[PDB]
Design a protein around this ligand. Structure first.
Ligand SMILES: CC(C)(C)n1nc(Cc2cccc(Br)c2)c2c(N)ncnc21
Ligand SMILES: [Mg+2]
Length: 462
């Protein structure tokens, strides 16, 4: 968790397979992190997903994965992520793909001023076209979420790009919005290509209403409704939505996979052929549903970072204690890096990419401190700044998620929305309510952002 999006590593000179030079971290996806990399010889830029062998187990043998890759390399579709190459070392699996500067689908949608029914039709059509092509070539996604649906460019020429296709069949860990889209076929272990239709049917339902078919402020609550398969159109949003659109959803959300509509039949459905041929939807509900998920995970990452950083601080202090032989408290720049590495060795786990992140971590803390030019640093001061910087980064991510959440709000969070946020964060109702008392002083039932953060801090303290 030492690699953040946007961070440059080209000074570190990290090379993958002796031909791909790491340059910029684009972020993190399924099973690993994605790194912008340039070809050492040609100069092509690529996106490389870095899956580590220690954190992520493999569900299949080495022969089957290679055959799957060779199949994915020969597949070309406008809505499917291109896979150029697969390789591995002692610590990582590497997947080389194209660079998509667009971003997630639901993010671009809630960044727009408004959303129409025709827009949702064009989006679904591209998705189904990609799913159809992959199904014809016997490839199943199994894990289709709005996170796995990107755009090629920042446009308008909207081009949907489906990613992580076929990765879930071979990989498994050894986020928060996954239970909404998972098919009952997968939950029963007996899945086929029809599960991707279910996932797409759920997305269409959300694109049209702004609300999940199978809702809940908790994974167990959501998965129970998915298991039941009981959904409805009893919403104010579906009152203006065409019967053609409802007919498509009904066919895609069939519990029995044999009865469930296929990808090509859905692509040739009456609703798509009419709406994408040659009425404005609730964008507020989509924005509410998306930002709530984003703010909730930002809350988890905040509390997660603060709590994790404390324990490693107590761990690095022990290590730095055994390195400070004169007891002056000052350590070398080289000694600080060694301490970080000895933390990993005592945990079993270093890699050159990992060593690069460590140096970057150390330097960024040293760049925040008025350094004495004797070459020595107080490690207590070092760890203190380390804590504050990680707290600062967590707040900035919290500010960005809140900005999206409060686009058309009163600047405050309700008491109900906290229940939805902390519910998805698996936080006990007795916990955040007791903290809400200390945070809300005028008993308004509503609180601003600073007060919301104070809650997260006090929760790490309870
Ligand atoms: C937003 C971010 C998480 C940084 N991401 N994720 C992917 C998807 C992806 C999926 C499988 C293998 C690779 Br390479 C890349 C991806 C991409 N293909 N291009 C640019 N960013 C990407
Ligand atoms: Mg010393």
């Amino acid at each position: 968790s030492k690699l953040r999006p946007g961070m440059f590593i080209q000074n570190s000179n990290v090379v993958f397979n002796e031909q791909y030079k790491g340059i910029k971290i684009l972020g993190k996806g399924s099973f690993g992190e994605v790194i912008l990399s340039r070809d050492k010889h040609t100069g092509h830029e690529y996106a490389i997903k870095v899956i580590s062998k220690k954190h992520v187990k493999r569900k299949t043998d080495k022969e089957s994965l290679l055959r799957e890759v060779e199949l994915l390399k020969m597949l070309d579709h406008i809505n499917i992520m291109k896979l150029y190459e697969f390789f591995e070392d002692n610590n990582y699996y590497y997947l080389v793909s194209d660079v998509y500067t667009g971003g997630e689908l639901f993010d671009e949608i809630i960044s727009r001023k408004r959303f129409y029914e025709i827009d949702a039709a064009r989006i679904i059509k591209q998705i189904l076209s990609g799913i159809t092509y992959m199904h014809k070539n016997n490839v199943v996604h199994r894990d289709l979420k709005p996170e796995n649906i990107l755009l090629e460019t920042k446009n308008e020429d909207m081009i949907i790009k489906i990613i992580d296709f076929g990765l879930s069949t071979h990989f498994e860990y050894s986020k928060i919005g996954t239970a909404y889209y998972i098919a009952p076929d997968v939950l029963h272990g007996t899945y086929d290509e029809k599960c991707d239709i279910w996932s797409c049917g759920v997305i269409l339902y959300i694109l049209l209403s702004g609300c999940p078919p199978f809702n809940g402020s908790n994974e167990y609550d959501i998965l129970k409704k998915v298991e039941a398969g009981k959904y409805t159109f009893d919403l104010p949003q579906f009152k203006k939505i065409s019967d053609k659109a409802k007919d498509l959803i009904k066919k895609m959300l069939m519990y029995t996979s044999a009865v469930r509509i296929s990808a090509r039949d859905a692509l040739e459905h009456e609703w798509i052929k009419m709406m994408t041929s040659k009425l404005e939807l609730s964008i507020a509900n989509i924005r509410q549903f998306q930002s709530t998920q984003k703010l909730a995970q930002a809350a988890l990452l905040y509390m997660g970072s603060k709590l994790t950083t404390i324990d490693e601080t107590k761990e690095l202090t022990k290590i730095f204690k055994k390195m400070d032989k004169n007891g002056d408290g000052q350590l070398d720049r080289n000694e600080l890096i060694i301490g970080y590495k000895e933390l990993l060795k005592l945990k079993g786990e270093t890699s050159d990419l990992d060593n690069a992140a460590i140096e970057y971590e150390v330097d960024q803390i040293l760049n925040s401190i008025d350094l004495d030019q004797n070459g020595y640093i107080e490690y207590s001061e070092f760890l203190t700044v380390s804590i504050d910087r990680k707290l600062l980064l967590s707040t900035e991510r919290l500010e960005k998620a809140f900005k999206l959440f409060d686009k058309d709000g009163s600047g405050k969070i309700s008491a109900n929305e906290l229940a939805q946020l902390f519910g998805l964060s698996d936080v006990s109702s007795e916990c955040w309510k007791t903290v809400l008392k200390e945070v809300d002083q005028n008993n308004d039932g509503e609180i601003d952002f600073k007060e919301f953060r104070d809650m997260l801090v006090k929760l790490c303290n309870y």
